Point group: C4
Chain length 25, copies 4
């Protein structure tokens, strides 16, 4: 388990990557 | 809970994203 | 130890960096 | 505390940011 802040940051990071890929495609 | 280093990195990462968005807007 | 989500995010982040470097080289 | 992999990723992430800033300056 991780600090809730770190979990939040990790989710944002993944969603950032997904949105970027979808934008490029 | 997380290593303090990881908490620090996550905060920096979020603030990086926010500043980028504000810059673009 | 970390949340599995955070471990996943960290792996993706590293692989993102590696792919970027290989692309540039 | 965090998974060693996550600590590694966080260090790389910070160093990435620092190098980028120094490059721009
Ligand atoms: Ca932990
Ligand atoms: Ca806390
Ligand atoms: Ca430590
Ligand atoms: Ca969980
Ligand atoms: Ca482990
Ligand atoms: Cl963690």
């Amino acid at each position: 388990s991780s600090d809730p802040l770190v979990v939040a940051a990790s989710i944002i990071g993944i969603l950032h990557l997904i949105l970027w890929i979808l934008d490029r495609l």
